[PDB]
């Protein structure tokens, strides 16, 4: 199984946030650490994406675009998986040094979003999602959000997305019920990512008033790319009608 071999081989390892767990929880400390974690994970997501089967078939502009649109969903989905495998979804396992209990969910001012992420984590358990299903689903998330007006070479993207869908189907191969379930789960990531994009955009704009630090790439992406999503110029590709 060449395709699964590759997904297993390229899967990123552990990423720490650099959070100081000796200091009391505060909104500014928790969010600054999540932002730094995003910056660190972005590096891993780029290295991973560039090594995916067929990724280099895309126009280079589109390679960069899909990463910059899909990172939130990719990272949330992976975090939900870590939470499921590490703490049975009892907490949000952002990183080994940044685990959210209910108190942190509250103090982050992101409780509603955290609730939804924890629900996503629980779904991995409720659906008995396999590691191989997780890997295929996560790869497909990279190819699940594009400009309404299309990419630089839409044809190459369409073909690549088609093949990742096929790879997910073959790993499934009850099969119809399963595929329906997994595509529903995939769709569910996108509204969660949208809420997080709105939250982080609003936070960036007022960051100087709440002492929240945004690293360089996060600040750029959140001000340059994320607004395309929030303004409706870039939209998720849903399997099912919402």
């Amino acid at each position: 199984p060449i395709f699964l071999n590759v997904l297993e081989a390229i899967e990123p390892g552990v990423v720490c946030a650099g959070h100081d767990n000796n200091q009391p929880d505060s909104f500014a400390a928790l969010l600054s650490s999540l932002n730094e974690l995003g910056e660190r994970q972005l590096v891993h997501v780029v290295k991973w994406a560039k090594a995916l089967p067929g990724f280099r078939n895309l126009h280079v502009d589109d390679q960069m675009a899909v990463i910059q649109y899909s990172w939130m969903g990719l990272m949330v989905f992976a975090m939900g998986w870590r939470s499921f495998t590490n703490v049975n979804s009892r907490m949000l396992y952002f990183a080994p040094d940044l685990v959210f209990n209910e108190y942190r969910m509250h103090k982050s001012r992101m409780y509603s979003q955290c609730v939804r992420m924890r629900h996503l984590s629980q779904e991995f358990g409720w659906l008995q999602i396999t590691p191989q299903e997780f890997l295929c689903m996560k790869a497909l998330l990279l190819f699940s959000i594009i400009p309404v007006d299309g990419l630089k070479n839409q044809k190459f993207f369409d073909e690549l997305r088609m093949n990742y869908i096929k790879e997910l189907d073959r790993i499934i191969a009850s099969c119809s019920r399963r595929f329906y379930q997994l595509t529903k789960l995939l769709d569910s990531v996108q509204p969660i990512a949208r809420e997080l994009y709105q939250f982080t955009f609003d936070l960036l704009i007022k960051s100087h008033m709440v002492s929240v630090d945004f690293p360089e790439m996060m600040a750029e992406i959140i001000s340059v790319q994320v607004p395309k999503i929030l303004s409706g110029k870039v939209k998720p590709i849903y399997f099912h009608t919402q």
Binding site: L42, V43, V46, K47, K50, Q63, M64, I67, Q68, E216, M217, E220, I221
Partner: peptide, 10 residues
């Protein structure tokens, strides 16, 4: 240019 710089740096 920060993301692009990362992307090209591998």
């Amino acid at each position: 240019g920060a993301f692009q710089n990362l992307f090209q740096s591998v």
